[PDB]
Design a protein around this ligand. Structure first.
Ligand code: NA
Length: 229
């Protein structure tokens, strides 16, 4: 997370750090349920059963004695996600144990798709940099479809993707943050999830933004997939 500060311990406790000893991969995630994690489609390989992935939770410090490590049991990747565009970039992961921490509610409408979103993960703070040890937090403004459209050299898919961050300011999610939730407060003072960190042109680039899977568009399709897991 480029130019972020430190998450206080327990601040966003629905946070997960994901490591896929199968595809050799490091993502973020959120506890949709206490044993189901919401994350990026591209952070995983296929759908089906998978004993391979290790979600760590409860700590903001990836090392503390206290983390809870739990192995995946089965993985559900959005059918129709295309690696070719990171389009429809969402996936669920079931856990073997459940994690007793507080979970993150998801937007089931678009009501909350404006203004300032909070983002977090353990990804790199410099583009090209190492993964972190302590969970970092940062703020990023909503960027319109239009504004984002123009600025991007890859193609941006209307309701599936939503944009956020700054023109020039050194504050953006970065390599290793994928799968972490983009979220913000709702009218009833609760965090709601609007994004999954998906991709961007580099990290915090001049004239470049951050792209996020638009939870609201898939919330339906998601809600329905957990219930089979
Ligand atoms: Na920027």
């Amino acid at each position: 997370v480029v130019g972020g500060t430190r998450a206080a311990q327990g601040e966003f406790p629905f946070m997960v750090r994901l490591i896929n000893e199968e595809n050799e991969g490091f993502c973020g995630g959120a506890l949709y349920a206490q044993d189901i994690v919401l994350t990026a489609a591209h952070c995983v390989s296929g759908s089906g059963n998978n004993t391979s992935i290790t979600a760590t939770g409860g700590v903001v410090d990836l090392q503390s004695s206290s983390a809870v490590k739990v192995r995946s049991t089965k993985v559900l990747q959005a059918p129709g996600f295309t690696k070719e565009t990171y389009g429809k970039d969402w996936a669920l992961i079931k856990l073997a144990q459940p994690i007793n921490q507080p979970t993150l509610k998801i937007a089931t409408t678009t009501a909350y798709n404006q203004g300032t979103f909070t983002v977090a993960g353990w990804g790199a703070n410099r583009e090209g940099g190492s993964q972190q040890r302590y969970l970092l937090k940062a703020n990023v403004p909503f960027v319109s479809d239009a504004a984002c459209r123009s600025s991007s050299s890859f193609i941006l898919v209307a309701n599936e993707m939503i944009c956020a961050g700054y023109d020039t300011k050194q504050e953006d999610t970065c390599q290793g943050d994928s799968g972490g939730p983009m979220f913000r407060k709702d009218n009833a003072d609760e965090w709601v999830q609007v994004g999954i960190v998906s991709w961007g042109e580099g990290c915090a680039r001049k004239g470049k933004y951050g792209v996020y899977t638009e939870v609201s568009t898939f919330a339906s399709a998601i809600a329905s997939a957990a219930r089979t897991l």
